[PDB]
Design a protein around this ligand. Structure first.
Ligand code: FE
Ligand code: FE
Lengths: 141, 141
C-alpha cells in the first residue's frame, strides 16, 4: 500500500513538527508575562504533547501493517483494521488542531524567523491533513 | 461497580457542560472582532465538539459494562477492558483540557453571569478529573 507509506511519512513528519513547535513555545512559556498568557501557551504545548504520545502508538501500528504489504496476501484482521481507522481518524483531527495552533501562533510570533518556520510547519501539516482526510473518506469501500 | 456509575455520572455531566460552554461561546464567535479572536474561540469550540463526539462513544461503552455489574459473575473481555481503559485515559486528558479551556475563558468573560457559570463548570470538571485520575492510577491491579 502506497497509502500506508504516505501515512507513515505524514505522521513521522508531524511528530518532528510537534517537537520543533514545542521548542519554539518553550522560551515563550518560561518568559510569559502574566497568568493568562502563560496558561495559553502552556495549554497548546500540553495538547501537542498529548498528540505526540498518541503518535507513538499510531506510527508503530502503521508499521505492523506495512510489514505485511509486500507479501500482499493476508487481509488485516477486522479488529486491527478498525483500531487503525479509529487512530487515523483521531489523528486527522489532531492534524487539523495542529494547523490551527500554528495559525494562532502566526498571529503572535511576528519576527521573520518564527514566521518562516511556522509557515513551513503549516504547509506540511496542510498537505498531510488533506491527504488523510481524502483517503479516510475513500475508505468506505 | 460504584466506579462505573461514577464514571457514567462524570461523563454525562461533562457532556452537558460542553453543551453549556458551547452555547456561551456561540455569540462570542458570531460577534468576534478580527481574525485572531475569531479563530481562537472557534478553535476551542472545535476541540470541545470533538470531545463531545468521543463521549458519545465512551458513555455507551460504560453502559455495556454497567449492564453486567449486577449479575457480577463474568469478567469483561480483556479486549473490552482495554478499549474502555484507552477511552477513559483519553477522556481524562479531555477533562483536563476542558478545565483549562474554562480557565482561559474565565480570563476573558468578566461579567458576573458568565463568571458564575464558568466557575460552576470548572468545579464539576475538577471533581470529575480528580476522580478519574485517581481511579485510573488505582487500575494497575
Ligand atoms: Fe488547541
Ligand atoms: Fe485547547
Amino acid at each position: 500500500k502506497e497509502e500506508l507509506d504516505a501515512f507513515h511519512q505524514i505522521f513521522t513528519t508531524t511528530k518532528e513538527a510537534i517537537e520543533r513547535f514545542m521548542a519554539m513555545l518553550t522560551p515563550v512559556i518560561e518568559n510569559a508575562e502574566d497568568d493568562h498568557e502563560r496558561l495559553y501557551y502552556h495549554h497548546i504545548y500540553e495538547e501537542e504533547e498529548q498528540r505526540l504520545s498518541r503518535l507513538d502508538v499510531l506510527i508503530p501500528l502503521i508499521e505492523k501493517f506495512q510489514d505485511e504489504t509486500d507479501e500482499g496476501l493476508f487481509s488485516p484482521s477486522n479488529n486491527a483494521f478498525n483500531r487503525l481507522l479509529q487512530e487515523l481518524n483521531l489523528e486527522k483531527f489532531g492534524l487539523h488542531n495542529f494547523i490551527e495552533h500554528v495559525d494562532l501562533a502566526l498571529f503572535s510570533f511576528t519576527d521573520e524567523e518564527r514566521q518562516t518556520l511556522l509557515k513551513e510547519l503549516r504547509k506540511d501539516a496542510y498537505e498531510g491533513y488533506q491527504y488523510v482526510k481524502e483517503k479516510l473518506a475513500e475508505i468506505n469501500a
